[PDB]
Amino acid sequence: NSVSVDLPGSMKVLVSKSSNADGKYDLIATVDALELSGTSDKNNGSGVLEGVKADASKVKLTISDDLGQTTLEVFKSDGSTLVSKKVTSKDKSSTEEKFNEKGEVSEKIITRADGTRLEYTGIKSDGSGKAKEVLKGYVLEGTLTAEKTTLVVKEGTVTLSKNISKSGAVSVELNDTDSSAATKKTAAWNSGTSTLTITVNSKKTKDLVFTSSNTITVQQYDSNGTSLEGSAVEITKLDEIKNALK
């Protein structure tokens, strides 16, 4: 009689076809090998299910009213302290958190809808930690603070820094310790187009575009330093970012 309902996060819940004397619906789900069960006052598969792991950890699956979001939580055996939390949001991005013995977040993995990831590890009580962005073809490494994520690529005397602010806004900067005006790279960030323009000797050399698709493209300027030439090329590997900083 039960109705199978498809959930975000590659899960399924079975909901009773009819409500009980309280007006409520029974919910059953199998997550990995774990059986979870619950009761809901909605008929569509939303609500709360609970179970226990073989090691007595408590498990809770919460499904939002519109089935847009799921939260899968694991707790200590008394149910008081979080051990892990995975939220799949309505855009199908996910956040996976682990918690120290006190239940403070110690690790957070964000998986975007396109599969690229922000990996935050060794998170401390001030929200600082290590950071890695996992892109298609390459990874960017850096640090996390409560103000921003800073991912760094070095090439020669040039340091490229991609910042992701606490609000999610991106800015990019370039620093070059080359003190010679003939060769030193400088760069300007255009927040409107998410483009870093690199200049050498008062002429633009290339545009690095940080796309909404979580890719980077590079396009050269003509020797005149004012017009772009050719067409932008998508970076596929870390060596190509380094080449763009030469």
UniProtKB/Swiss-Prot annotation:
<keyword id="KW-0998">Cell outer membrane</keyword>
<dbReference type="GO" id="GO:0009279">
    <property type="term" value="C:cell outer membrane"/>
</dbReference>
<dbReference type="GO" id="GO:0016020">
    <property type="term" value="C:membrane"/>
</dbReference>
<comment type="similarity">
    <text>Belongs to the OspA lipoprotein family.</text>
</comment>
<keyword id="KW-0732">Signal</keyword>
<dbReference type="Pfam" id="PF00820">
    <property type="entry name" value="Lipoprotein_1"/>
</dbReference>
<dbReference type="InterPro" id="IPR023322">
    <property type="entry name" value="OM_lipoprot_dom_sf"/>
</dbReference>
<keyword id="KW-0564">Palmitate</keyword>
<dbReference type="InterPro" id="IPR001809">
    <property type="entry name" value="OM_lipoprot_Borrelia"/>
</dbReference>
<keyword id="KW-0614">Plasmid</keyword>
<comment type="function">
    <text>Induces host (human and mouse) cytokine release by monocyte cell lines via TLR2 and CD14; nonlipidated protein does not stimulate host cells.</text>
</comment>
<keyword id="KW-0472">Membrane</keyword>
<keyword id="KW-0449">Lipoprotein</keyword>
<protein>
    <recommendedName>
        <fullName>Outer surface protein A</fullName>
    </recommendedName>
</protein>
<dbReference type="GO" id="GO:0009986">
    <property type="term" value="C:cell surface"/>
</dbReference>
